[PDB]
Amino acid sequence: ISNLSMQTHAARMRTFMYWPSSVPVQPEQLASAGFYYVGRNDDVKCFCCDGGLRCWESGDDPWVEHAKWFPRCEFLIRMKGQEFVDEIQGR
Template sequence: MSNAEVIASRLLTFNQMYSYEKRLQTFSEWPFREDCQCTPELMAKAGFVHCPSENEPDVACCFYCLRELEGWEPEDNPWSEHAKRSPNCAFLHMEKTFDKLTAIEYFQLEQERLHVAYGQTDRCSQQKVYNLRAPLGRAHLLLCVGPPLGSPHLTPEEALPHTPASPPLSIPSFHT
């Protein structure tokens, strides 16, 4: 699978990982359980999802910034490791839990998540603009989705393919 396909797959799958409980469920085969800093509970609280491979049973990936970390040691603190490797991850700097977000805050985070996934954090590529005025009532928000400027000519539809096999996107509940 190409890097773009991995990113697209994770963006779609990890969209459902806003929930701590769903992240925790991914750690059923996590090798560190007791007498350590990187327990499944602490890993999930720090935003990680367990995504092991045959050769790397301890790979964890932040559902938000998609930063993959491996080679965990029992004394590794998930929050510290996450901050060292991805200091600009918005998940680390949130002041509220996802269930307390307003609709606008949620969509702003999603916009940032897409930009981070495509290596773009400063400006919108303007390739695809979604006007979210109707779903949000009086609120108005433009959500720009697409690859970073200067990248190979990849449309958002190509980058985030929607196929019948793709899981439906679920938006967590939030306050209006």
């Protein structure tokens, strides 16, 4: 695990206090997919794989973007399973 202080959903949810309202991806589904707000623009990191994501568009799924960019993540696999990841990566 990279940021151990963000392993709990509620810890991650607090970082989304300064999240811009303009961003069209919800802090709830971002904190659910392992992401926490880093403090600048829309930059989010996975507490587990340390993978960073940004430039969130409308109609994005944080879990799908998690598997699209960091599929070998030991948290994405424990939460959504390899059968979700393989359908996304193998598209």
